[PDB]
Amino acid sequence: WKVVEDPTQLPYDHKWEFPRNRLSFGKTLGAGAFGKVVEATAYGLIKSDAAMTVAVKMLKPSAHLTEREALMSELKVLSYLGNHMNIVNLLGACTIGGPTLVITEYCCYGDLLNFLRRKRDELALDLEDLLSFSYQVAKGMAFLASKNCIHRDLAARNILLTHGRITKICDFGLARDIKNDSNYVVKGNARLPVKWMAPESIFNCVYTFESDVWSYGIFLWELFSLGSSPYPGMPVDSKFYKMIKEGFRMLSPEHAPAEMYDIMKTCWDADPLKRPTFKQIVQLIEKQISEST
Numbered sequence: 001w002k003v004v005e006d007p008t009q010l011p012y013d014h015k016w017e018f019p020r021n022r023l024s025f026g027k028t029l030g031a032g033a034f035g036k037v038v039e040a041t042a043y044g045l046i047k048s049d050a051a052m053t054v055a056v057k058m059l060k061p062s063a064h065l066t067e068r069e070a071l072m073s074e075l076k077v078l079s080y081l082g083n084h085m086n087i088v089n090l091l092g093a094c095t096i097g098g099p100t101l102v103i104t105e106y107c108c109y110g111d112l113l114n115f116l117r118r119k120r121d122e123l124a125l126d127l128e129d130l131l132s133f134s135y136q137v138a139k140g141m142a143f144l145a146s147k148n149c150i151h152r153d154l155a156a157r158n159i160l161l162t163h164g165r166i167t168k169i170c171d172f173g174l175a176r177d178i179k180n181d182s183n184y185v186v187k188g189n190a191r192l193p194v195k196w197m198a199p200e201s202i203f204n205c206v207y208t209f210e211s212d213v214w215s216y217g218i219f220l221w222e223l224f225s226l227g228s229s230p231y232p233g234m235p236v237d238s239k240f241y242k243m244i245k246e247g248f249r250m251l252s253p254e255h256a257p258a259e260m261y262d263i264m265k266t267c268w269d270a271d272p273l274k275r276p277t278f279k280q281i282v283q284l285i286e287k288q289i290s291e292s293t
């Protein structure tokens with residue numbers, strides 16, 4: 001991510017310092033080449049001494065100094081952002097006594113992408129459920145933009161679903177295998193989620209709040225498609241780069257309401273400045289949520 005007008009400039013509040021000995025590691029939730037997320041049990045974290053379930057992000061012994069300092073920066077940013085209902089909230093850290101361990105909220109229903117594909121043909125997902133995730137993810141992204149922060153990888157895979165059908169925006173990062181995930185394309189220097197990126201991001205590497213809105217539009221698409229891959233069954237080749245720059249967008253999903261598709265259209269505008277802000281999107285989804293009463 002970015003902290004636009006530095007992650008190392010951010011300070012570390014030692015109020016998050018939690019001891020390694022009060023964590024009990026369990027089922028590995030996510031795993032990448034240098035890091036992974038583990039579902040651990042933190043004895044005495046919120047209450048005085050009451051056990052709770054957390055997701056501890058950590059690295060494998062194969063991660064070196066840049067990868068380790070990337071994790072300390074991840075931690076500093078989360079500490080800064082603080083709390084929001086619709087983000088995977090930082091619960092504490094272990095920085096002293098060993099390697100970096102970033103202890104965060106655990107979302108029991110895993111990611112939204114796999115949840116949607118499971119729900120695609122334990123409770124049925126209706127239109128009100130999908131509209132809720134639109135509003136919730138929009139609110140969380142509006143809060144990220146509010147704290148002058150930019151995700152750079154907003155997708156249904158990087159959105160988790162917890163109890164009470166609450167979507168929380170997260171980032172696996174080093175904790176996901178970009179090698180085998182075919183949604184990440186090689187670009188001669190690194191692997192990027194091309195299908196979810198804006199033109200300035202693809203052709204200029206300009207990662208601004210505005211580009212995070214095109215990515216949000218791509219999320220709206222897979223959300224309303226109940227899991228479908230953006231530009232499905234399609235290879236991410238040079239032929240792909242032409243029609244996108246031309247102005248070719250995705251067709252409306254079989255379940256997407258009319259107002260929602262208009263939102264994907266303005267998000268998918270060629271001009272990054274003529275795109276809705278995350279705060280304005282909240283008001284539009286609020287409108288459609290009241291219209292349904």
Ligand SMILES: C[C@@H](Nc1cncc(-c2cnc3ccccn23)c1)c1ccc(N2CCCC2)nc1
Pocket residue numbers: 029030037055057078081087088089102104105106107108109110111151160169170171172
């Ligand atoms: C530190 C990191 N922890 C994390 C990352 N990804 C997913 C989970 C996770 C929680 N529960 C489950 C269950 C199943 C699978 C995964 N998980 C936890 C993190 C990284 C960025 C982050 N944010 C918040 C502002 C934008 C990015 N929040 C948190």
